[PDB]
């Protein structure tokens, strides 16, 4: 959709996080609006990140190491040293590509557990970080897993102290595990000013 902030319309694709920066992605255009930032800002991706494609399928960082990882087609970037590995045209296939994966929707990491999982339309998969092997299949729910949230989920992020922001469509709902709950029902055009 548009970015079209005066219009409840708008959808995403992904969204990562950053130290304390949250940066939206939008087909070929990123959003930026965090920290000090009154107003957001479309700008081309490729205008900035070099080697690095456009139409990102699921951004999820890892504060660990500080990292990042672009997801696109059946290729993955690696971020270093905020510079994607040069000549990488690495593919999932190289140990993940189950049935027939290649475009992602949303992905995760959870650092109260050590495990990242992706969602596949309607599907909820879940790579061991640990132990380094991805669960067999593993065809689970997500609105099922996680009630509130839904059984599409666009953007994921975890951007918080202990919370999940989690969006699809033009909403923008937060789960606390707290008590697997959900006190935030605002949308993307929410913070912008409409
Ligand atoms: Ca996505």
């Known amino acids: 959709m548009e970015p079209a902030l005066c219009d409840p319309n708008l959808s995403f694709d992904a ?79 190289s140990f993940g590509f189950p049935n027939f994966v290649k475009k992602i929707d949303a992905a995760v990491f959870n650092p109260r557990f050590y495990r990242t999982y992706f969602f596949v339309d309607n599907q909820y998969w879940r790579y061991d970080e640990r132990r380094q092997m991805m669960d067999p299949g593993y065809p689970k729910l997500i609105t099922k897993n996680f009630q509130g949230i839904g059984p599409k989920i666009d953007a994921v992020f975890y951007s918080k102290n ?33």
């Open 15 to 93: 969204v990562t996080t950053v130290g304390n920066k949250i940066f939206f992605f939008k087909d070929r255009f990123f959003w930026l609006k965090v920290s000090e930032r009154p107003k957001t800002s479309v700008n081309l991706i490729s205008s900035l990140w070099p080697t690095l494609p456009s139409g990102i399928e699921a951004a999820y960082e890892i504060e660990a190491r500080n990292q990042v990882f672009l997801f696109k087609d059946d290729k993955y970037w690696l971020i270093s040293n905020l510079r994607p590995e040069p000549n990488y045209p690495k593919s999932i296939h």
């Open 162 to 194: 202990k919370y999940y922001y989690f969006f699809q469509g033009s909403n923008q709902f937060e789960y606390d595990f707290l008590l697997q709950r959900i006190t935030k029902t605002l949308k993307s055009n929410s913070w912008f000013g409409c």
